[PDB]
Design a protein around this ligand. Structure first.
Ligand SMILES: [Fe+3]
Length: 54
């Protein structure tokens, strides 16, 4: 699945990993993260992530 970078801190949201510590099962696409999900490292909103693809 895809990977997304937090433009602020460099955390990688890896769709294959999800974010289970913060309520997100492995396999959850970035689009499906709740609107108020934030970077677990720096707190940046979803707007600050960039999909790692051309
Ligand atoms: Fe971040």
């Amino acid at each position: 699945m895809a990977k997304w970078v937090c433009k602020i801190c460099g955390y990688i949201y890896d769709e294959d990993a999800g974010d289970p510590d913060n309520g997100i099962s492995p396999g959850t696409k970035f689009e499906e993260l709740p609107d108020d999900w934030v970077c677990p490292i720096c707190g940046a909103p979803k707007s600050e992530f960039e999909k790692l693809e051309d």
